[PDB]
Design a protein around this nucleic acid. Structure first.
Lengths: 136, 56, 143, 78, 100, 93
RNA sequence: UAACUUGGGAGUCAGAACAUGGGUGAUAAGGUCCGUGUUCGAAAGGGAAACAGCCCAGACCACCAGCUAAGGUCCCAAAAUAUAUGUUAAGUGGAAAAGGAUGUGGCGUACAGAGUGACACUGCGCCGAAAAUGUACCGGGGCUAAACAUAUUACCGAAGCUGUGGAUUGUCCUUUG
């Protein structure tokens, strides 16, 4: 349940989401990584589901890193209400991902057990992915 | 007396800023022509509307 | 004003006999359509008929391309509730080969009072024997 | 089911009023600001509310005054 | 025999001894005109090509000078209270070919 | 065998650089000591393997205009999505 | 080729769609509120099958004259069943996703006795794909090129431009032309 301990403002604007990724396009902690090829929003619940599956397959084999964090919240309106009369209330926290960013990095295992722990975790995410190694 | 510019496309549907550059050169209607000498400020007007006229 | 105009006192209509043996359905009907309309004469007039007569023999031996012998179906409604029938092009060639070419050429003509008169100058047979020898038909090769 | 916001104050027309190289009179306002974002120069005065005005007739000149600081001056035309 | 003559922005097919109607010319009644530009000289005799047969002029005689039948020009637009009515009569010259 | 090279003359347009990368050739700049700033052209594959032997800091010995100059790789640009090198900087000590 | 000043007379204060930069809503609405340009409003003509806002283009009048724009050239229906080299077999073209497949091309890195495996980045297809009067999402016939990609050479095509003859208003202001 990743969520910032405190924020200055609880009602923000939504990110642009159009363009290419800004930073974090390389592997710097582990031996392998999972790279994204499309744009989408990632919620804390999705990150939780996608990392528990990876941990189970590896059987506590090595280290796993999460390079994304849901910094931005989003509001939602009640059910069956009319337009206007103020803004909604916080519902959850999301993160913006664009083509060329790494989501998960693992280390301490082989190249085969690592290519199967990331495939079982890429089906929990709403974005397309790819297998990438530390570039030589 | 060095250049010849003729208007090929009309001005309907164009921004008002471009319709004003077609007036400084001396173009009234479609297919109308005019003769002027190659100046540094003359080519600055054609470059702005190079998608509408045909310099020869 | 000097444009020529054709009337029913200077028009000559002849008789042709075209063969459909080993020919594509769509590419053969598009040529017969222009003959029935008179689009090949230099004295063409729009408000009068100036085409000729055409006889189609060996209709049962037309050809299709691909899987159109099963995927192409013909529908028709009887004006009653739920009264819609159907038949495939492959099954129609084997039963009524003349209605297959007759309806394929009739759809390439205008739907006017003059176009219905130009569509009656067509005769289709499934074999090579036609009863119109008295009309003295002349052979025609498709271009 | 209500809003707590919805207040705002009238906008003040701050910024420069004359351009560089332009001729002005003895009492022409040159820059309205809060505080001192641009300092006065030769033949320039700072008003009560930090407004910059000229004192003679001449051309306006926006120049730099030190690292990361700007000024405005006025020179008589010859 | 025949010839194509260009007179008023159009072309015509004239024979010897035929009546024609063209745009208003300069000649008055009873004078003689001459078609400088001949584009084609047809028939079974010696023919020629283009752009324009040098020479081989045509001669005619001016018969009448009148105005075509009156034409009424009307236009309107529904629900806008806008209409316009005009009249028009096109002048013409009637000639008669003499010899090609 | 020393690798081959080409000299980019003038100034290329956005389209010229894109078409050059499409062909299989990557642009490069050499600004090391003892040389001027010249734009060069080297095959992407030819560089990918010659760098295998010399490694990261081995001596390239690239030849510009009939004059071989001993050089090394200082920094380069890489496209992670399409996995295509974009730019190479050669530094001659 | 305008602009500014003084005076006489007005109308207008319900706006709309498209592109684009944002808030709001659910990165829903032919939704709603602002920035910027165009069109409609008050704009006929050609194209998009029909279709105020989309594309081309601004109708003084007459003609059985010519050249072009958008869009097009097998038949309905005016113009190439044109030329050169390649791709697709599904009616794809002529409606959609996550995912699933030695379907088929292009460019790069002893296997049951001289041919078999393993990858990366990419063309065009397949499955995933169920609504109520009747074919029913090519406008119809129909088409395997009459589909797609990269080019060349012709032609058709507006009330646009030109040619010819006439109206009204001007500016020309030195032989009423």
């Amino acid at each position: 349940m990743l969520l910032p301990k405190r924020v200055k403002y609880r009602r923000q604007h939504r990110p642009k989401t159009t363009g290419r990724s800004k930073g974090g396009n390389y592997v710097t902690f582990g031996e392998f990584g999972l790279q994204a090829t499309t744009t989408s929003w990632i919620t804390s619940r999705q990150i939780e589901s996608a990392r528990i599956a990876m941990t189970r397959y590896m059987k506590r084999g090595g280290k796993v890193w999460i390079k994304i964090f849901p910094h931005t919240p989003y509001t939602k309106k009640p059910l069956e209400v009319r337009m206007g009369a103020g803004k909604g209330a916080v519902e959850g926290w999301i993160a913006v991902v664009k083509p060329g960013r790494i989501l998960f990095e693992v280390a301490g295992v082989s190249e085969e057990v690592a290519r199967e722990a990331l495939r079982l975790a890429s089906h929990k995410l709403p974005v397309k992915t790819k297998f990438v190694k530390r570039e030589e | 007396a060095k250049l010849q510019i003729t208007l090929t496309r009309s001005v309907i549907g164009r921004p008002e800023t471009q319709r004003k550059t077609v007036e400084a050169l001396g173009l009234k209607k479609t297919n109308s022509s005019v003769v002027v000498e190659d100046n540094p400020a003359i080519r600055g007007q054609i470059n702005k509307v190079k998608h509408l006229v045909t310099v020869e | 004003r000097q444009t020529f105009m054709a009337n029913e006192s200077n028009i000559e209509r002849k008789w042709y006999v075209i063969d459909a043996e080993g020919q594509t359905l769509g590419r053969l009907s598009s040529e017969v359509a222009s003959i029935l309309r008179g689009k090949n004469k230099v004295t063409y007039t729009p408000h009068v008929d100036t085409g000729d007569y055409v006889i189609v023999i060996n209709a049962s031996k037309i050809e299709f391309t691909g899987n159109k012998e099963t995927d192409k179906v013909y529908y028709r409604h009887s004006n009653h509730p739920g009264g819609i029938k159907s038949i495939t092009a492959g099954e129609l060639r084997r039963t009524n080969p003349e209605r297959l070419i007759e309806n394929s050429i009739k759809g390439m003509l205008p739907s006017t009072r003059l176009g219905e008169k130009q569509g009656k100058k067509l005769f289709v047979y499934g074999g090579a024997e036609h009863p119109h020898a008295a009309q003295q038909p002349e052979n025609y090769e498709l271009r | 089911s209500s809003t707590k916001n919805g207040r705002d104050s009238e906008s003040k027309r701050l910024g420069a009023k004359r351009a560089d190289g332009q001729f002005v009179t003895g009492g022409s306002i040159l820059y309205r600001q809060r505080g001192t974002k641009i300092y006065p120069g030769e033949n320039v005065g700072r008003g009560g509310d930090d407004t910059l005005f000229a004192k003679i007739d001449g051309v306006v000149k926006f120049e730099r005054k030190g690292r990361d600081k700007k000024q405005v001056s006025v020179y008589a035309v010859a | 025999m025949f010839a194509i003559i260009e007179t008023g922005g159009k072309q015509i097919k004239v024979e010897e001894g035929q009546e024609i109607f063209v745009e208003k010319l300069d000649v008055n009644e009873g004078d003689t005109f001459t078609f400088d530009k001949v584009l084609f000289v047809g028939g079974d005799s010696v023919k020629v090509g283009a752009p324009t047969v040098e020479g081989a002029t045509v001669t005619a005689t001016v018969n009448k000078q009148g105005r075509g039948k009156k034409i009424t020009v009307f236009t309107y637009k529904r629900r806008k209270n806008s209409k316009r009515k005009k009249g028009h009569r096109q002048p013409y010259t009637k000639l008669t070919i003499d010899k090609i | 065998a020393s690798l081959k090279s080409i000299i980019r003359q003038g100034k290329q347009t956005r389209s010229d650089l894109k078409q050059l990368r499409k062909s299989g050739k990557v642009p490069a700049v050499v600004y090391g000591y003892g040389t001027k700033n010249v734009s060069v052209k080297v095959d992407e594959v030819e560089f990918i393997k010659v760098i295998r032997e010399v490694g990261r800091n081995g001596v390239i010995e690239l030849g510009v205009g009939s004059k071989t100059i001993k050089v090394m790789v200082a920094d380069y640009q890489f496209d992670p999505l399409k996995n295509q090198i974009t730019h190479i900087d050669f530094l001659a000590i």
